[PDB]
Amino acid sequence: DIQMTQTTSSLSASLGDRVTISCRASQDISNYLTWYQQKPDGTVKLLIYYTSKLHSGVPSRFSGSGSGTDYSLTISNLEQEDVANYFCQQGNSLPPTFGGGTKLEIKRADAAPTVSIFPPSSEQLTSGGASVVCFLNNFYPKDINVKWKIDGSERQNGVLNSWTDQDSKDSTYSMSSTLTLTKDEYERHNSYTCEATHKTSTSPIVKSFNRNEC
Amino acid sequence: EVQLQQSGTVLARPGASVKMSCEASGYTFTSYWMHWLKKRPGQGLEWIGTIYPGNSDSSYNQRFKGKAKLTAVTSTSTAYMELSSLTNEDSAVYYCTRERGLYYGGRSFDYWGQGTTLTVSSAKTTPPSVYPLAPGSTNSMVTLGCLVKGYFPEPVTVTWNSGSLSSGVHTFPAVLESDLYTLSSSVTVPSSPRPSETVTCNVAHPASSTKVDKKIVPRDCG
């Protein structure tokens, strides 16, 4: 059914640099290929059609190429507003099909996460629940793993994570990892630990606390 | 130039139906084909169908046959899509867009709507519980936050000291747990000014018409 795939989900580059996004089709779409730009606000703008044809109103730093099954979008001099999600669609046959998109992100110096851990509030314990929260703020790159450890055993249930989009100011990422339990389960263990491993250091960032402790 | 304006976010129950609209402007509505697309988070844009206002000629994807009905009203230049027998997999962002041949042979979409977000759940409107996050039992800086839990639907708004602290703050996207939303917000200050002057997270959840202010206070023992 003509499936359009974009192998790269995310792409990192610096301002002024030349970046190229790729799109592949499951069969020959005969040069009928179009590129779109989707900014975070959610707005969509058409950039290039018929593989190489620039749409009216688009800056000349945008270019397109390709043939048969493979196609590519190029941005010669990256500007800050060029930070967006770029996706393709084929106009050769029905149904119209799109690529998953390629998210464009900015490049900066690697930074370690500032980690902080928070025991459940006394106010939440009155409800019967217990949420242990771990903040990992302002690190780069975005790839990161968090590990919840209780005493000696690792814990994978009740852990919900949330990532911010790249900060448009300092180009960093931040993340919250929250371990959720009930009061009884929380009160039957002592050591709660939040471990973060990042490119910036071989050693994991460890923040812990003990419930028995004040 | 050619503006399209879609409907606001919509909440719906499973088994229910919804109807979203797209107001066309800046061109002759009865001339160009309008198309509807479905965007789910992890996945690519999906084509539902298209309608030609004026003759109401339509074409649908086999997958959305019986699920989505497309229609057009010329007088008000507005397109509509109706979704029936709703499920959670129908939760997504739906786009309205115009087709135009920019090259002989091809099919492209030159102008788009801002999108309409549809949320399908059996959850009922529930206010958020707001819990202060203070550290246990020290560096130059100290990080605080407040956890906002078990609310529905989105959105909820979080500020610090009524907005007087816009910096060192990170408010995280909500995540879904048992049909209820949850998020947290962090705020960083030097460790000089804090237990000493007040730091308060302010949560607003308009849907339930609630505003809550939790001052963050250090937890001592005894």
* DSSP secondary structure string for all residues of A99-168: ---EEEEE----B--EEEEEPPPHHHHTTTEEEEEEEEEEEBSS--EEEEEETTEEE-TTEEEEEPPPPT
- What the block records as the tokens of A41 is 């606000």
DSSP-assigned letter for residue A184:
H
Measure in Å the smallest separation between the Cα of A167 and chain B Cα atoms: 10
- Domain that includes residue B208, residue range: 123-219
Calpha distance A197→A144 (Å, rounded): 6
Q: How many residues does chain A have?
A: 214
Calpha distance A132→A210 (Å, rounded): 12
Calpha distance B81→B90 (Å, rounded): 13
How many beta-carbon contacts under 8 Å exist across A and B?
Answer: 140
| DSSP-derived 3-state class of residue A82 | helix
3-state helix, strand, coil in chain A (%, to 5): 5, 50, 40
Give the angle subtended at the CA of B183 by the CAs of B117 and B193, to the nearest 5°: 135
Residues B133 and B198 in one domain: yes
Residues B116 and B131 in one domain: no
Residues B101 and B131 in one domain: no
Q: Domain boundary residue among B85, B100, B122?
A: B122
Whether residue A67 contacts residue A51, with contact meaning beta carbons closer than 8 Å, is answered with yes
Residues B169 and B145 in one domain: yes
CATH number at residue B1: 2.60.40.10
Q: What is the number of domains present in chain B?
A: 2
> For residues B100-124, b (16+ Cβ closer than 10 Å) or e, as one string?
bebeeebbbbbbbbbbbbbbbbebe
Whether residue B73 contacts residue B23, with contact meaning beta carbons closer than 8 Å, is answered with no
| DSSP-derived 3-state class of residue A205 | strand
Residues B132 and B83 in one domain: no
Closest B-chain CA to A123 = B131
- HEC string for chain B: CCCEEECCCEEECCCCCEEEEEEECCCCCCCCCEEEEEECCCCCCEEEEEEECCCCEEEECCCCCCCEEEEEECCCCEEEEEECCCCHHHCEEEEEEEEECCCCCCCEEEEECCCEEEEECCCCCECCEEEEECCCCCCCEEEEEEEEEEEECCCCEEEEHHHCCCCCEEECCCEEECCEEEEEEEEEEECCCCCCCCCEEEEEEHHHCEEEEEECCCCCCC
Nearest by CB to residue B102, choosing from A4, A53, A89, is A53
Residues B114 and B176 in one domain: no
Contact yes or no for B133 and A133 at CB 8 A: yes
Residues B140 and B76 in one domain: no
- What the block records as the tokens of A58 is 């688009």
Contact yes or no for B44 and A174 at CB 8 A: no
Residues B108 and B6 in one domain: yes
Radius of gyration for chain B, computed over Cα atoms and rounded to the nearest angstrom: 23
Measured in whole angstroms, the distance separating CA A127 from the mean position of its chain's CA atoms is 34
Resolution reading in Å: 2.7
Calpha distance A35→B210 (Å, rounded): 44
Residues B130 and B118 in one domain: no
Q: Is the bond leading into B41 cis (omega within 30 degrees of zero)?
A: no
Residues B115 and B193 in one domain: no
**Beta-bridge partner residues of B130:** B148
Contacts A53 to B, Cβ<8 Å: 102-103
- Give the number of other CB atoms < 10 A from CB of residue A44: 22
* CA-closest candidate to residue B88, choices B13, B37, B36, B151: B13
Measure in Å the smallest separation between the Cα of A192 and chain B Cα atoms: 12
Residue with tokens 């609310």: B151
Residues B13 and B100 in one domain: yes
Give the angle subtended at the CA of B190 by the CAs of A202 and A116, to the nearest 5°: 40
Contacts B110 to A, Cβ<8 Å: 46, 55
- Give the number of other CB atoms < 10 A from CB of residue A29: 25
- What the block records as the tokens of A79 is 């500007």
Nearest by CB to residue A100, choosing from B44, B47, B186, is B44
A199 interfacial to chain B (CB closer than 8 Å): no
Q: Domain boundary residue among B104, B122, B140?
A: B122
Q: Is the bond leading into A141 cis (omega within 30 degrees of zero)?
A: yes
- What the block records as the tokens of B178 is 């048992």
* CA-closest candidate to residue A4, choices A76, A97, A71, A132: A97
- Give the number of other CB atoms < 10 A from CB of residue A208: 12
Element (H, E) at A185: helix A183-187
DSSP-assigned letter for residue A43:
-
DSSP-assigned letter for residue A96:
P
Interface test with B, best of A162, A166, A194 (most B CBs within 10 A): A162
Q: How crowded is the C-beta side of A94, counted as CA atoms within 13 Å?
A: 9
Q: Domain boundary residue among B122, B144, B170?
A: B122
Whether residue A107 contacts residue A95, with contact meaning beta carbons closer than 8 Å, is answered with no
Give the method of determination. Answer: X-ray
**Domains contained in chain A, CATH given:** 1-107 (2.60.40.10), 108-211 (2.60.40.10)
Contacts of range B188-196, beta carbons closer than 8 Å, 24 or more positions apart: B188/A114, B188/A137, B188/B141, B188/B142, B188/B143, B188/B144, B189/B141, B189/B142, B189/B144, B189/B165, B190/B140, B190/B141, B190/B142, B191/B138, B191/B139, B191/B140, B191/B141, B191/B142, B192/B140, B194/B142, B194/B144
Radius of gyration for chain A, computed over Cα atoms and rounded to the nearest angstrom: 23
DSSP-assigned letter for residue A30:
T
Residue type (1 letter), A56: S
Residues B77 and B129 in one domain: no
